[PDB]
């Protein structure tokens, strides 16, 4: 639900 760098929510 969230990528390695935190994108998105």
């Amino acid at each position, epitope marked *: *639900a*969230r990528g*390695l*760098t*935190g*994108r*998105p*929510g």
Partner: antibody
Amino acid sequence: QIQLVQSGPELKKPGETVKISCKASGYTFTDYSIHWVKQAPGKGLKWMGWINTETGEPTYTDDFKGRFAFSLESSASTAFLQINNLKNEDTATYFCARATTATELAYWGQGTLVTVSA
Amino acid sequence: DVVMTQTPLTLSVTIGQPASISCKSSQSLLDSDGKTYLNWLLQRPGQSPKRLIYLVSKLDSGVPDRFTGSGSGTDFTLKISRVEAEDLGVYYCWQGTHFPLTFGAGTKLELKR
């Protein structure tokens, strides 16, 4: 409407601990990432990592793995940054940022100045 | 980490005239989904940083239309058609395509005299 307000200035001595906060308003807090960025005085920017506001799982970059802890108090829409065993080189302004779909550092806090001195 | 190289580090400008800033990366920023996560920020004196451009050329909410961002691959550019007093401060390009996020060194705009 979208704002992130950080805690006030801190003066600490080496070896002590500090915990700074970032209260978010204007949106559903658990919908987006909270990021932490350091700026030593008169210098550039450095990403410390982020925290997942739904699961609470933190991710730290190489230079901030050890003495740093990111946390939440989701019921109060707040994220915290705790630094243990403070050292002189920790002196800087720390910023919290919130992610959007195409950008990780979209909305910024005003920053919290931490000065470490004996 | 990806090295972001901004040229020049200090750019002398004139109010009413155009300015240009170059940002080159050590590796390609074209990501898996066909998008390029290259952003630009502005940090005015005594203030916290503030979002300008994302996805190479998309201006953010309420950013003056006179700010132009362009590029692809490893070469990018931010141009200001006509510079103003509000535009003075430190500009940073930064990337989100690769972990960990990295920033350029910053480019300070000063007034020429």
